[PDB]
Each structure stands twice: as C-alpha cells, then as structure tokens.
Amino acid sequence: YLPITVDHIARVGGVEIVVGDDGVKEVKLNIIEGPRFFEAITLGKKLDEALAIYPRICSFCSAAHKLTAVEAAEKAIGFTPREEIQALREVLYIGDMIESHALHLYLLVLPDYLGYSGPLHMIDEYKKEMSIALDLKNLGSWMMDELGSHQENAVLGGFGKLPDKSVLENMKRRLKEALPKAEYTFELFTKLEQYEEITHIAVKPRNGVYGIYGDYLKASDGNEFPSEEYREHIKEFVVEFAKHSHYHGKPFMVGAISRLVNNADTLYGRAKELYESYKDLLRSTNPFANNLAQALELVYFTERAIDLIDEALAKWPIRPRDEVALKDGFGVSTTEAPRGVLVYALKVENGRVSYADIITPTAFNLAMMEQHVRMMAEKKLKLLAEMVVRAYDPCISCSVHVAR
C-alpha cells in the first residue's frame, strides 16, 4: 500500500505528579504492564509449555509464579498433592519470601531513611545491615537453588528432583542461624518512622488469604467478609498502563500488612510474641508498617520453615507423585506472594489451556498507591513519594515531579 515516513518519537517505569502554585494539580502512575499478552499466547498451548511461559511475567518473583501456576493446574485437573511435597513447595516459597523481603527492605527502604545514594557498601555504616541482608539473600537463594532448578524442579503433580536429607538438615541449621539476623531486622525497622519520610495514615481495606497455621498457601479470600473463590471488580483506567482493581467497590491494599491484619491469630512462635508486643506499630491504617511487617514475616517464615522441614521428615523416603491431565478442570489458585496476593486462573480443555487469567499483587496495590499520594511538600517531595511507593514494594519504580 501507500508508503510514507512518520517518525516515532520514543525519547522516553515511573510515577508522575504535577503540582502548582495553587496546590497539586494531577497525579497518575503507569508502573506495570498487563499480563494479558501471556494470557493471550498460552491459549491452546500444552499445559507444560504454558507453565514454562508463565514465570516470565514480573521475573522478580520468579518462583512464586511457577508455584501458583502449577497449583492452579493441579486444581484444574483434580490432582491434590501430598502433604510432604506441599510442605516442600512451601519451603522453597519461604526461601523466595526471605530473599525478596530481605533484599527489598535493606537495599531499598533503608537508604531512603538514611538518605544514601550510589554504591550501598561503605565502611562508616551499614556493614552489619548488609551482612544480614546478604546472608538472608544467600540463604533464600540457596534454598531456591536446592529445591528448584526459572524453577525446573517445579513440575505438575510433584517435583523434578529432590535432594538428600543432609542438605535439608544443614538447611535447618542455617535457618536457625538466620533467625537472630531476622530479629535484628525487625528491631531495626521498629525504630524507623511510619507515615512519614506528612502522614499518609488513613482507612484502608487490606486483603489476604487464610491458611490454618500460616499465610503462605490458601484456598479462601481473607478480607472482613471472606469468600472462597470469587472475582472482584476490575476497572480499566488509562493514563494515556495496567488495569486497576477495586474490592467491594473501593481500592484495597495487599502485602504483609494484609496477612497480619487479617490472619494475626494464626501466627505462632517468636513472631507471635513480637506481634503482640508491637501490635500498635503494625496497624491497618498505614502503608509503611508493611516494611516492618515484612521484617516480622522474616522471623515467622524462618521458624515456620523449620517446622515444615520436620514435616518433610515425617516420611523419611520421599518421591514425586504423578498425575493424569483431565479436561474441564478449572483451577483458581489464590496464593500469597511477597508483594501480596497472586491470583492464577487456569481452565484446561483437551489437555491444553482454554482460559488463563493472571493478576499480580502490584495491580492490586496500584489503586491504593494512586490513593495514598496525599503527600504535600515543597521541592524533596519526590523522595517522600518514592518512599511511599517503595512501601508497597513494587517490582521497580521512579518518581518525576512537574510544575504548572
């Protein structure tokens, strides 16, 4: 057809806020992209191939995506995994949790409060904090490398391979060694100011999932009025940009604070005592508490992991079972990711993916992220907004301030 030349100007994630002499005028953010593409491409593909494709979305939580994906698949085909392999899945998952949380809190949240820029390793401070961060990161990543191989070990109906019991005992030892570091993290994050770098404290509905002894895996939604499995409203608002989500007609927040608020009574161990001690600090009305909340989840998930490890030893020989693919299975798995609740929905037909709907926690958190920009300051405002954003722990972010 008719040839022309029209140049496409791409001078070029981020959050944009426009402010004025009369006050702030506008604030909008496009920080994540729709997973729709994947939802579109995997349709008609084999279940294994789709399960291989899915972890490509938001690669930072690489493990989580895989685990919830396979969970959805199993729930579709009607397969229910053994308690041992389920426990192991939760252990690997716990590793991912440790890595994500530690890395996020230390490398992102602390330099904001202490005002650092550039390289984050320096003599005069932070040696010990980084020692803890690096040790936790190493521990989690090592657990992920030992129980996973993207996760090659994670397969439909079981595991690709399973290591010796020796490395599991050593894992227990290393975890027990890692406990006081997490405790120091919680103590350190206890002292830092919340709702400020201008309080952003307000009413905020938190959403989570409920598991009998913990919040890792679950089959029921966790807000004030619970549902087993349902589709909350979703709204398409465009900056000029992913789709936003509304629970019960209002924006809602997901993350560690949601797990604590909704499922506090389910906790136990040192983390329970710590929660009872600082219950006022981890309140439902503030975003920054999430950071501290995450720190708490370290300790819990550390101790919990140990218990889980012992459960794996309840049956000394372990072997990954096999399942048969079944049509008509529709499986909605609402899992809990370090970011928040991750939702996977897979309907299988003739052994192939017939329907796929994936919702990432950052999509949930984006509405409230837009809401909690009630930060008034005169630029430095960028830094404050950045802190508020980092409180929600998105995959990546950046703040731009504009006048007029």
Binding site: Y1, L2, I4, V6, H8, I9, A10, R36, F241
Partner: protein, 124 residues
C-alpha cells in the same frame, strides 16, 4: 518497553489518520531497528489492543526489521552487527563493540537505532 513503543506507534498512526481525514485504517507497516530490544509479538499484540475502539481497528500490522550498521570514524570503516554476532546483542553497544579493524571503540550508528512507520493503508 514494548507497550510504550506500541503506544507511540498507535498514537502516530491515529494522528496521521486524523490529519488525512481517514474514515478507517486497514494496514500498517512498521520498520523496527534491530538495536531495539523489544519483542515483535508483544508490540504487535499491544498495538492490536490499543487499536480497539478506534477507526484503526482490526488493522493488519506488519513488522520489517532494519539491520544495524556501524561506521567507525577513525579508520572510516563500516561493518554490520551480523558480522560481530557470529562468535542480548542489541542494548547499549557503545560499551563493548568496536571496529573489527581498529582498537578504537569510537563509531556512529547509521542504521538500526530508530523505529518508523513505513506504510499506512487508508480507507476514506
């Protein structure tokens, strides 16, 4: 990013259609430089989604790749990316790539950096 670039393409195409007083758009051919690390499938899909609800809807999008050509200034010698590929390649060459002949690292990208719409099919 794929979605941003796709947004640029869609906006530009729709702008062109508005200027030409187009009743409908049926086909768009876009030329992408290989130095762009974007994935054609994601960009195409995104374009398809953004194209919905406009005159340019259900339009057929074709992607043509423009090879990357580098011209070292010192020796004044030109070579292509395929020649160096044989041993991700796209991003930020200036860092690693140099002329096969010179020990220089100084060169200019002549082809393959930009993205432009080469063809548009209009129905009025």
């Amino acid at each position: 990013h794929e979605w941003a670039l796709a947004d640029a393409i869609v906006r530009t195409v729709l702008d062109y259609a508005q200027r030409e007083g187009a009743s409908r758009v049926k086909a768009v051919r876009v030329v992408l430089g290989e130095l762009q690390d974007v994935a054609e499938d994601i960009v195409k899909f995104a374009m398809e989604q953004l194209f919905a609800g406009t005159i340019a809807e259900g339009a057929e999008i074709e992607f043509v790749e423009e090879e990357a050509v580098f011209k070292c200034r010192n020796c004044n010698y030109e070579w292509k990316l395929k020649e160096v590929k044989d041993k991700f390649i796209p991003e930020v060459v200036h860092a690693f790539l140099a002329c096969p002949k010179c020990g220089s690292h100084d060169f200019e990208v002549v082809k393959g950096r930009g993205v432009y719409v080469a063809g548009i099919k209009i129905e009025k």
